[PDB]
Symmetry: C2
Subunit: 344 residues, 2 copies
Amino acid sequence: MKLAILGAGCYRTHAASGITNFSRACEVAEMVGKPEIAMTHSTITMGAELKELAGVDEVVVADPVFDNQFTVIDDFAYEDVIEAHKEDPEKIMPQIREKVNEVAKELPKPPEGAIHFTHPEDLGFEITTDDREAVADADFIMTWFPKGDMQPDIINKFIDDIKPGAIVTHACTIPTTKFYKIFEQKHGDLVTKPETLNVTSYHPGAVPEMKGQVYIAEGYASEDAIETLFELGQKARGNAYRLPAELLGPVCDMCSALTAITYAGILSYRDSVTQVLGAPASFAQMMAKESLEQITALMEKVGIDKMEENLDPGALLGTADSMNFGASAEILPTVFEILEKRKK
Amino acid sequence: MKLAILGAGCYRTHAASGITNFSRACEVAEMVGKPEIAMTHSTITMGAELKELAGVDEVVVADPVFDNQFTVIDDFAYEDVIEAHKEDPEKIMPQIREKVNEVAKELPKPPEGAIHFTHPEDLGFEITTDDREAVADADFIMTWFPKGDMQPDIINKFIDDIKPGAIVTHACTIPTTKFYKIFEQKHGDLVTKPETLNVTSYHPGAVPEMKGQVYIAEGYASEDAIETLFELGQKARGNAYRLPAELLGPVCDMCSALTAITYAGILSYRDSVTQVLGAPASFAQMMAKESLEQITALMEKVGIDKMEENLDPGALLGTADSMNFGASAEILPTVFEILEKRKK
């Protein structure tokens, strides 16, 4: 199956963040004993995984940057990086970052400049400048395009070259429904039938070189297409998650912390109800619905910053404490610590 | 002013639950040196507070139960109760539950049979059997009616006797909107003028005799009417919380645990965003809304019992960890242990 990767990505914002490392990239590099996989990033990391771990032998990378200022930082040896990542990545990341921040200071933004440490070339990938030729006959198209208004412009350039049935993916720079509407703009043509395309995500939920995980949005691709990506992703990335398109941002964006907290609440609360009060799940659901809609409606009504003025966080200490049993007892005591600090 | 207490309560369901005690009732007994207050429950405990701590000079309790099987269990001297509660309430509570449970297996439900340990008469309370008489010129009507479709029937008897602008309250046996709608049914009358009534709540959020707290629903009363009820509750119950009626159930009922967990989540999450990222509150609220709504939409779509089949609880571990800072650091590590356990 031919994989066309569209967008090689740039490292600058990984370095500038100050909190990324190469720990996944190092893990695969060792699995397959190819040290140069160790400092791959973004789409190049995920491409090595697909080729080396998931039997995907035909990989093309396309990016206009290859014919511009594609810069390869050779200052650091693969081996020292692998070595450092066994005990503490921080023995080496500070200087990797400084070196990149310095190169990035003067270097144009991607599609004109991009910063890597290992050429995709060196991993047996076809490299090209022409998106149209990359996608010709491609069964899996991985897009990795910049945020905002350029994505439809990038995409309409090659859309009619995408073979019917293809799997076409996006990552963190666009929401799925926005990505989908681009292909939708082209429904009606009978020569291409983009209506047959399987649109979804291959979202790392983090810089891929740091973490083995991928997030696959459901709602637009076929069952078969997402089962296919999920197997491929499990294998290549180590950890795959198949979830509805409408939870992609809630799970992957910086609201993830609130999503995690409240999903934990829900599961804990549900269990303490079913398992210790013997109720059917619908009883727990009904209560949970009202509780979630009402706290949410309060936040919308007065402002997130003004909730305490309207509902004294201490109001909950005298009622919820008698629910402090079963699964809920895992979370409730920490919650009590927070509300007690915060009361009027 | 005049407080009309409508319903004396029965102890049987407090005993039957096996988790209540008299620890508030005891507290106020010692604050005013009347040991007989130690073994009040329900509406009688709260009436002692408003008379003896808030300076409510005049109290009527109405209940058809007084002309029937109003049984005062005299077995236990207030003194062993008071003493027991100073150290450990469980040294005595079990035999009290035993005695109540016994004499309650055979005794008619309330309005026909009711169990108490101190007669309202001994507290210098006016006792009556006629609601209409109890409410004449009463400024604060505290209702304490059974759950179900008798509440309208009960209220439709004295509705035309309630003086204009009166405070009218409810507790755990009816939601405020449902309470309101009963008075609604008379909103045409020029003589009654029920349009002028200040409908709210005086909800304990637990058995009154165990905890000093009250919960006051906003939305139907005037601002001054809720203000003055708040002052009274403050002094009478020890802790008062005034909140929107839409939140009464989410806060006081079985779902309290979830409302607590998620409210904690919201506050920590917001704080970490404004104080650490330096973004306006509106940014956090925008994120929080999508997160709350989507996780709730999911529960509703697949069933609270099937969520994990659709969104792997481990999906949140590789994304939410990057939000582990500021106030969210107080709660996220606990959340991580819960998700970790439940992951597919």
